[PDB]
Amino acid sequence: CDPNPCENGGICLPSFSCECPDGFTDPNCSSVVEVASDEEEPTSAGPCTPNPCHNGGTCEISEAYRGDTFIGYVCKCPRGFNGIHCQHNINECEVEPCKNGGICTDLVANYSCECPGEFMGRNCQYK
Ligand SMILES: *[C@@H]1O[C@H](CO)[C@@H](O)[C@H](O)[C@H]1NC(C)=O
Ligand SMILES: *[C@@H]1O[C@H](CO)[C@H](O)[C@H](O)[C@H]1NC(C)=O
Ligand SMILES: *[C@@H]1O[C@@H](C)[C@@H](O)[C@@H](O)[C@@H]1O
Numbered sequence: 716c717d718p719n720p721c722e723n724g725g726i727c728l729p730s731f732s733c734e735c736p737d738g739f740t741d742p743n744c745s746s747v748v749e750v751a752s753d754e755e756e757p758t759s760a761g762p763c764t765p766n767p768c769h770n771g772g773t774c775e776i777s778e779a780y781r782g783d784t785f786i787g788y789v790c791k792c793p794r795g796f797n798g799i800h801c802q803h804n805i806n807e808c809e810v811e812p813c814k815n816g817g818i819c820t821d822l823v824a825n826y827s828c829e830c831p832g833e834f835m836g837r838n839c840q841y842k
């Protein structure tokens with residue numbers, strides 16, 4: 716058995732199948748067995764509910780620590796955004812795309828340029 720497919724410490728026999736110890740269940744001994752008091756015990760919703768991600772990000776379960784805290788998810792950001800929660804509109808003016816003294820304005824996944832006189836072009840690249 717490739718080294719352990721089974722989480723929670725279930726023993727694996729061969730493609731592969733896992734003997735689940737007392738309290739665990741498929742898939743790969745990752746799930747829950749219960750009795751009466753378990754229901755009426757408060758459920759936690761997932762790390763993705765409610766959605767932690769802003770700006771249209773996609774929350775995904777992952778092996779993720781912020782510092783020494785296991786947060787168990789990451790946010791997949793759309794073009795133009797970043798940050799742990801996708802909270803940041805990326806500043807596309809940081810890398811100074813407007814040349815020859817042009818002034819950059821920031822847009823979602825884009826920028827535009829106002830050109831000092833006699834310079835022209837999308838990037839002010841032309842004199
Ligand atoms: C916005 O970004 C797209 C993608 O690069 C680009 O083709 C387009 O020129 C931009 N829109 C503007 C500012 O005209
Ligand atoms: C888990 O907790 C949330 C918080 O209110 C909801 O009550 C949810 O309904 C619970 N889980 C289940 C079993 O639906
Ligand atoms: C998850 O990924 C992010 C980046 C967006 O594409 C969402 O539409 C999708 O659900």
Ligand SMILES: [Ca+2]
Binds near residue numbers: 795804821823824825
């Ligand atoms: Ca931007």
